[PDB]
């Protein structure tokens, strides 16, 4: 157990990895949802529809 | 991927050396129970006399 807790990815390790990560990915879905809403609007003016 | 890799072989490397000295006591243990055996021989050779 003892050398489970000093391994290089302990707990600590992923937990704060996993963090980050969901932040990360928490704003680039907006962003990327912007982006799929611009493009539907370029369609939308093309097609006159 | 690399790190995760290492730390289950090093993991490993651990369980095998403590294995190996539980057998050494093991073989101690087994010895002491010889010994006792001999212990009753001897004992019914007094009975038989």
Redesign the interface.
Known sequence: LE??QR???NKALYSWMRGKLSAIYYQFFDLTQSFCLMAQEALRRELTD | SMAEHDDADELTTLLLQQGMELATQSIRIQQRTVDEVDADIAVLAESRR
């Open positions: 050398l489970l391994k290089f990815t």
